[PDB]
C-alpha cells in the first residue's frame, strides 16, 4: 500500500479558499500532478483528463 502523492511545489501558492456549489469542476497542472481548483486560473483545462495527458505526472 504506497502512501505518497504529488502536490504544489515551491515557487506557485493553492487556493486557500473552496467553492464544491457550482455544477462544474477544475483542473490545472503545476510540475507534474493535476490539483483541483475552483476558478478561471488564465483557462487552463476542463477534464481530469486532458490536464493529466498534457503533463509528466
Do not use: C, N, V
Given at each position: 500500500g504506497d502512501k505518497e502523492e504529488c502536490t504544489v511545489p515551491i515557487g506557485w501558492s493553492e487556493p486557500v479558499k473552496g467553492l464544491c456549489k457550482a455544477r462544474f469542476t477544475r483542473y490545472y497542472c503545476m510540475g507534474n500532478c493535476c490539483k483541483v481548483y475552483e476558478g478561471c486560473?488564465?483557462?487552463?483545462?476542463?477534464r481530469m483528463g486532458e490536464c493529466a495527458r498534457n503533463c509528466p505526472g
Open positions: 486560473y488564465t483557462g487552463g483545462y476542463s
